Design a protein around this ligand. Sequence first.
Ligand SMILES: CCN(CC)CCNC(=O)c1c(C)[nH]c(/C=C2\C(=O)Nc3ccc(F)cc32)c1C
Length: 294
Amino acid sequence: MENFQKVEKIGEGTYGVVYKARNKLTGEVVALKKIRTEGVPSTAIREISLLKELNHPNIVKLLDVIHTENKLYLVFEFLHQDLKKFMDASALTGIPLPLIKSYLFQLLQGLAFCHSHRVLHRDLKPQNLLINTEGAIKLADFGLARAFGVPVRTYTHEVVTLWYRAPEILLGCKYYSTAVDIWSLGCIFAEMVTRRALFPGDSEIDQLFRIFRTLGTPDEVVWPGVTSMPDYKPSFPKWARQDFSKVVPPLDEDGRSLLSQMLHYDPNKRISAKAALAHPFFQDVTKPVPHLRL
Ligand SMILES: CCN(CC)CCNC(=O)c1c(C)[nH]c(/C=C2\C(=O)Nc3ccc(F)cc32)c1C
């Protein structure tokens, strides 16, 4: 883009490539996301504007959309680090619980806001969560698989993480609900705590079976309707649920109780972002400042 000097390529998206870029007029530093070119739907750019009018301290601001010359550019505010990088950097000592807690609380606020506005993320993962020096965390790179839609790639030969995908998606449900984002955020919370991915599947079925081995193979008792879902097979192995205290030690009982509710199989039993904010886990929540090396 001639309006912009690329400083660097800071991420490889689901949709496209993200660049750190400077505006030659304003001198403002931004994140620039470029999307691959068929006639490049009209319908898409409509509901991108739905993302543009979202303003919340926990949602990364979308500054502009630019359709010119058969690529789509999304201009976003720039943040200095992503949670994936921060977790890797914190792997030795772990992220302090008060900071984990503030981050979870803020992400739930962000989700509560998005969801009350009928916007789903669908894509949540540590790479998509951005932090700053003042202790804020923000939802970014909304994946919307309507308002556009879903490829199997981003641009070139990049491998999509299934680790955060809700079981209803894996079982082939056509219609997502807001519950899919709470699932992903639950997986992220566990990972901050234990410093290991909770469900690191290497394929769709391995992802499913990893969830089953830990939470038990779902049945009609815990998840009415499950056996009727498009990708469900009666031939799935039957695993018993693991004791939950094995899962995220040493998280306290308030944390485990909240996590267990974010991880319910039935999208209808799964806690809402709004209700999650009222959980006793957050009674002592504060806003600590992260030690960030930029
Ligand atoms: C392994 C961790 N990371 C993945 C490659 C490596 C490092 N990458 C980083 O730290 C990083 C930084 C410093 N900014 C972003 C991305 C965005 C940003 O700032 N505003 C946005 C608005 C929308 C959006 F969709 C992405 C961004 C990343 C991934």
